[PDB]
Amino acid sequence: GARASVLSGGELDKWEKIRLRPGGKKQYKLKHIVWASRELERFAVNPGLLETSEGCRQILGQLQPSLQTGSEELRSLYNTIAVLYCVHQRIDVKDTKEALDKIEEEQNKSKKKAQ
Amino acid sequence: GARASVLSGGELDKWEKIRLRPGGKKQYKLKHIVWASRELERFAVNPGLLETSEGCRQILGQLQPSLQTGSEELRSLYNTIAVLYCVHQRIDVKDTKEALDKIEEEQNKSKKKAQ
Amino acid sequence: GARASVLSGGELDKWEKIRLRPGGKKQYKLKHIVWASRELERFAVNPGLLETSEGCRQILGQLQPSLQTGSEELRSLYNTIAVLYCVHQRIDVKDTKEALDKIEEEQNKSKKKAQ
Amino acid sequence: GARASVLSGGELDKWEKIRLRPGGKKQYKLKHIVWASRELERFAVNPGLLETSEGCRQILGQLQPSLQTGSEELRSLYNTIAVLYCVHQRIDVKDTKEALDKIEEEQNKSKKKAQ
Amino acid sequence: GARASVLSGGELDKWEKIRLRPGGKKQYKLKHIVWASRELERFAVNPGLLETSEGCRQILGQLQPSLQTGSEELRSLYNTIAVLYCVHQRIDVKDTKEALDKIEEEQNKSKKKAQ
Amino acid sequence: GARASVLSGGELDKWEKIRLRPGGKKQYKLKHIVWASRELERFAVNPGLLETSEGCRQILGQLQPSLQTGSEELRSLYNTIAVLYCVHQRIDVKDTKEALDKIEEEQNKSKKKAQ
Ligand SMILES: *C(=O)CCCCCCCCCCCCC
Ligand SMILES: *C(=O)CCCCCCCCCCCCC
Ligand SMILES: *C(=O)CCCCCCCCCCCCC
Ligand SMILES: *C(=O)CCCCCCCCCCCCC
Ligand SMILES: *C(=O)CCCCCCCCCCCCC
Ligand SMILES: *C(=O)CCCCCCCCCCCCC
Numbered sequence: 001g002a003r004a005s006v007l008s009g010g011e012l013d014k015w016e017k018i019r020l021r022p023g024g025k026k027q028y029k030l031k032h033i034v035w036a037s038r039e040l041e042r043f044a045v046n047p048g049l050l051e052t053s054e055g056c057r058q059i060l061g062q063l064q065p066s067l068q069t070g071s072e073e074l075r076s077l078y079n080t081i082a083v084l085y086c087v088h089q090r091i092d093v094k095d096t097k098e099a100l101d102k103i104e105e106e107q108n109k110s111k112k113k114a115q
Numbered sequence: 116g117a118r119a120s121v122l123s124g125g126e127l128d129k130w131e132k133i134r135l136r137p138g139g140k141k142q143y144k145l146k147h148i149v150w151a152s153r154e155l156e157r158f159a160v161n162p163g164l165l166e167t168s169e170g171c172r173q174i175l176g177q178l179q180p181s182l183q184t185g186s187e188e189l190r191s192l193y194n195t196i197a198v199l200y201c202v203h204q205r206i207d208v209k210d211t212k213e214a215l216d217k218i219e220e221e222q223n224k225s226k227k228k229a230q
Numbered sequence: 231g232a233r234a235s236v237l238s239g240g241e242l243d244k245w246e247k248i249r250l251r252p253g254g255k256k257q258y259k260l261k262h263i264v265w266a267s268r269e270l271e272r273f274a275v276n277p278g279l280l281e282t283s284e285g286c287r288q289i290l291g292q293l294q295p296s297l298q299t300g301s302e303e304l305r306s307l308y309n310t311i312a313v314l315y316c317v318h319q320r321i322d323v324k325d326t327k328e329a330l331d332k333i334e335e336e337q338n339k340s341k342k343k344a345q
Numbered sequence: 346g347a348r349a350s351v352l353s354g355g356e357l358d359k360w361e362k363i364r365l366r367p368g369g370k371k372q373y374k375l376k377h378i379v380w381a382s383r384e385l386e387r388f389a390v391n392p393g394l395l396e397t398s399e400g401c402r403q404i405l406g407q408l409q410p411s412l413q414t415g416s417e418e419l420r421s422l423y424n425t426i427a428v429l430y431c432v433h434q435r436i437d438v439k440d441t442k443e444a445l446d447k448i449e450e451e452q453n454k455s456k457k458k459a460q
Numbered sequence: 461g462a463r464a465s466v467l468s469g470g471e472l473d474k475w476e477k478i479r480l481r482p483g484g485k486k487q488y489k490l491k492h493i494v495w496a497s498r499e500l501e502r503f504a505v506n507p508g509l510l511e512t513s514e515g516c517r518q519i520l521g522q523l524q525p526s527l528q529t530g531s532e533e534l535r536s537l538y539n540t541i542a543v544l545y546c547v548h549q550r551i552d553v554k555d556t557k558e559a560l561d562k563i564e565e566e567q568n569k570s571k572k573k574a575q
Numbered sequence: 576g577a578r579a580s581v582l583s584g585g586e587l588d589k590w591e592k593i594r595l596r597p598g599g600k601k602q603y604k605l606k607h608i609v610w611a612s613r614e615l616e617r618f619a620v621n622p623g624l625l626e627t628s629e630g631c632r633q634i635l636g637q638l639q640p641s642l643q644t645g646s647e648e649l650r651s652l653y654n655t656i657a658v659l660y661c662v663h664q665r666i667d668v669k670d671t672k673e674a675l676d677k678i679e680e681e682q683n684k685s686k687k688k689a690q
Contacts, residue, residue: 017576023621043274046184048364058184069288069289071276072276134508159273161299161300161301186368414506416504416505
């Protein structure tokens with residue numbers, strides 16, 4: 001079933017246009033997704049939620065408290081999830097940062113109706 | 116000290132008569148506790164908390180926030196503990212859902228003590 | 231660089247005088263720091279937080295809710311960091327119990343400026 | 346004519362992506378469909394009713410009261426039908442519980458504006 | 461746990477002392493429970509319900525509308541369950557007919573208390 | 576992503592149909608594009624900015640005060656960037672003159688609300 005987002009014009013295709021870091025020639029591979037899937041099993045975070053935007057949304061919210069203190073792999077994973085989230089939401093980034101930006105702002109939009 | 120628990124009418128005797136799932140044929144076994152002991156150690160949690168209702172009430176509180184995100188193994192563990200809790204409280208549960216019902220009833224009760 | 235580890239009146243010179251138990255004849259060692267660094271890495275935490283008081287403060291903040299149900303290793307990990315915190319802050323402690331006393335006294339400072 | 350529904354975007358394609366329970370890797374199978382047909386014949390329910398959401402709806406109305414005391418295979422049959430029902434309405438669940446919540450919403454709400 | 465079936469005054473001690481008919485010399489035998497166990501599996505009814513008076517109470521309600529046009533095997537099952545209910549409730553019924561009288565008296569307690 | 580510019584109905588299709596000059600005998604060749612891209616790496620301009628109209632717009636405004644004293648390769652490149660902008664915006668010119676007009680208009684459209 002995972003192969004349905006793996007299409008050209010889909011999420012994996014877009015993923016490989018998204019840089020790990022904004023000025024690089026290199027984009028995230030499929031293997032970071034696999035790796036991330038496994039790591040989330042290691043954190044007891046269920047991988048199917050990865051095809052579900054709100055489940056990811058909450059995961060990012062659950063994770064934010066741990067990013068300040070967590071490992072570089074956790075930050076790489078957070079950024080991987082953050083990009084996958086914007087990718088599943090069909091919002092367009094050339095790189096990692098823009099997603100972070102979109103998130104915090106989505107969270108600011110959440111803050112505005114958090115009152 | 117394990118030999119204190121193997122008496123007829125004890126916690127293990129009740130344990131082996133409790134259904135894993137509401138409609139489940141099979142019953143809880145000791146290996147679920149052993150597996151759970153190992154898991155809590157993997158989570159840097161005291162496995163000895165599985166022997167008391169104060170301990171179990173606290174573990175269930177610790178694990179509950181991770182259930183939405185969790186794996187079957189974790190849910191099966193949580194459920195195993197809800198049953199252990201009910202057994203330590205001498206509540207004669209016959210399955211997992213009923214044990215779980217009891218836990219959330221106890222939460223409604225603690226709410227009554229904290230209005 | 232190496233001269234720093236044979237420094238007189240330095241942090242390691244103080245560390246080896248601190249007792250494991252209040253009256254005891256056994257003192258803190260370098261291998262406890264090595265173990266704690268490896269464990270934090272195992273727990274998906276940035277080990278770079280051990281070098282300063284503020285990184286350690288974040289770790290102790292992180293560990294405090296987990297103490298209630300924590301393993302003996304997790305409590306040992308907390309206790310080790312608390313003694314190091316005291317060394318970093320230049321608090322003169324002779325044993326583990328005194329380090330815990332000093333830590334609880336430092337935590338009452340934010341209470342003092344609550345009005 | 347069952348094959349008309351095993352095409353991509355159809356019943357089987359979605360069926361194989363729906364979890365048997367909210368938490369696990371085991372997803373629904375075609376052999377379960379061939380079974381569901383046999384089980385409805387066991388209850389004198391015409392399997393051709395599974396091709397219409399209204400057939401299924403009235404059946405679920407028929408069928409739900411027997412689940413409190415009946416088999417785990419019967420609960421599976423109800424849930425299997427609830428998913429086939431959802432396939433026709435194209436309610437997008439990832440799992441069975443979400444279907445059950447959607448079913449008891451479908452068997453409720455209209456209740457308030459039907460009374 | 462075997463010692464429960466040969467307990468003086470236990471449920472099976474009572475079972476074997478309850479007459480199959482009021483004028484008759486025949487008493488309920490364990491094999492009626494066994495025979496009933498195949499029948500409950502055949503009717504897709506959970507066998508664990510006959511270990512408890514509430515599960516039995518609910519089954520007797522479920523069977524109640526269906527008895528007027530039923531089979532001898534089914535009536536023999538209903539009557540077997542009515543005796544098991546009475547035994548589980550610790551009602552010292554001496555025959556099948558008394559177990560039925562007790563079921564209809566118990567059904568009237570909540571009628572007496574209807575308003 | 577240079578290969579995205581290779582779409583039929585896309586940028587290369589249009590480039591090969593766009594005269595290099597208002598009445599130019601030669602039309603765009605992919606080698607000028609490689610070279611152009613490279614040249615922008617020479618000028619500290621990220622090539623990913625040439626895969627978007629926003630990138631090209633920002634580049635032209637920056638470059639613009641320096642256009643009067645720049646090189647013929649840079650002016651050919653400037654008019655190419657102007658065209659890259661126009662093809663990304665799906666604006667149809669057959670030569671570069673119209674693009675100039677559109678750009679001054681974009682500069683004038685941009686300045687029209689600047690009050
Ligand atoms: C459904 O596609 C079942 C097969 C799952 C394994 C596919 C392996 C290759 C693609 C992995 C994509 C992971 C991210 C969506
Ligand atoms: C505390 O009891 C120490 C550890 C005991 C190990 C398990 C013993 C379980 C009971 C055995 C009873 C054998 C009777 C023949
Ligand atoms: C660091 O303090 C500067 C010197 C780094 C080069 C190696 C020094 C070797 C001598 C160290 C002291 C004696 C051995 C522990
Ligand atoms: C339909 O045209 C009637 C003739 C029989 C068609 C069989 C198609 C089998 C498809 C896979 C199994 C479906 C099980 C419900
Ligand atoms: C449950 O109560 C535990 C029962 C343990 C065994 C009791 C002794 C059984 C003796 C059987 C003797 C042979 C009978 C044919
Ligand atoms: C995006 O396509 C970058 C990765 C592929 C590069 C090789 C194919 C390039 C085809 C067009 C020629 C280059 C023009 C700048």
